[PDB]
């Protein structure tokens, strides 16, 4: 899905059970390949140290 617009979409269905996982990734804003290439993760790759909070918005 990396050579597509499907990399940005998170699939959601109607299940027959309860308590399933949707996604999951480790919080590494400059080394993990999920948050690596975003607008926040490109400024961090010019520096070495970072500190502060991080917002995550879901639509």
């Amino acid at each position: 899905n990396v050579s597509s617009l499907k990399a940005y979409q998170i699939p959601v269905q109607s299940n027959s059970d309860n308590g399933k996982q949707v996604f999951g990734f480790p919080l590494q804003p400059g080394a993990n390949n999920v948050l690596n290439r975003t607008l926040l993760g490109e400024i961090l790759n010019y520096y070495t140290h970072w500190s502060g909070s991080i917002k995550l918005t879901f639509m």
Partner: protein, 267 residues
């Protein structure tokens, strides 16, 4: 430039909804983490001083290097001034659309001995000349030329074994800012050259040995370093994903947005 500090908070049960928003408005939410959970009071002493535009861009970066040989017919070097032949400074300057700065120029000159055939080769100290020709002036065609008289073109002389030469350049432009991107043509008929090559007119830089070829050839190499001072910047831009291919245009080969993993739940 201190950052904001944390405010203590209490358990709530109310009508106010900080966590619920609408991202469809094109408006980034202004929530702090003291609205979604219970926090303590923390005084932050951190500063944002190292991320300024004056601190991010004011470092020396190599832009070109050229060679020229002593014992050679027409042995001298030329370079048309641009900032698009290197990959590291081109990606830093193209985070913005319009820039305006002064310049600082530094040259690093070396030398090397070529395999001559004579015995008892011993050469004196070498002297170099670096000339700048603004667009429209006369250009040198050889080493022993009248165009090196430098009556009004600025030049510099340097003897090997000292500190490197350095000078300052002001904001030389015809517009109100430098332009990293140009979406248009140079002709009114919309033919021919399309892109940033229609705005690039900065001059040419010439290099030569002032000494004579005594008894053995010598090959020199100059290196040029740019350093922007007094920087202003406008209209930020996404960083480049693909690799650069040419100098005049922005042609690329398509590539994926990230690297892959084996599952969506893989940590």
């Amino acid at each position: 430039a201190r950052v904001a500090d944390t405010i203590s908070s209490r358990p709530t049960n109310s009508e106010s909804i900080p966590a619920l928003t609408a991202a469809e408005t094109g408006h980034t939410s202004q929530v702090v983490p003291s609205d979604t959970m219970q926090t303590r009071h923390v005084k932050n002493y951190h500063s944002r001083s190292e991320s300024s535009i004056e601190n991010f861009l004011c470092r020396s970066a190599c832009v070109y290097y050229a060679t020229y040989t002593n014992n050679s017919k027409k042995g001298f070097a030329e370079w048309v001034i641009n900032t698009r032949q290197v990959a590291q400074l081109r990606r830093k300057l193209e985070l913005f659309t319009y820039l305006r700065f002064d310049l600082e120029l530094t040259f690093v000159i070396t030398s090397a001995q070529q395999p001559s055939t004579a015995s008892s080769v011993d050469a004196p100290v070498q002297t170099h000349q670096i000339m700048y020709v603004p667009p429209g002036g006369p250009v040198p065609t050889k080493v022993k030329d009248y165009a090196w008289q430098t009556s009004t073109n600025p030049s510099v002389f340097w003897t090997e074994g000292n500190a490197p030469p350095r000078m300052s350049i002001p904001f030389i432009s015809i517009g109100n800012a430098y332009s990293c991107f140009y979406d248009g043509w140079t002709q009114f008929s919309r033919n021919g050259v399309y892109g940033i090559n229609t705005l690039n007119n900065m001059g040419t830089l010439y290099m030569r040995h002032v000494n004579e070829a005594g008894q053995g050839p010598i090959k020199s190499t100059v290196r040029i370093y740019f350093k922007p001072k007094h920087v202003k910047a406008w209209v930020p831009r996404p960083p480049r994903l693909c690799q650069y291919e040419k100098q005049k245009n922005v042609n690329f080969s398509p590539i994926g947005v990230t690297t892959s993993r084996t599952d969506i739940i893989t940590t």
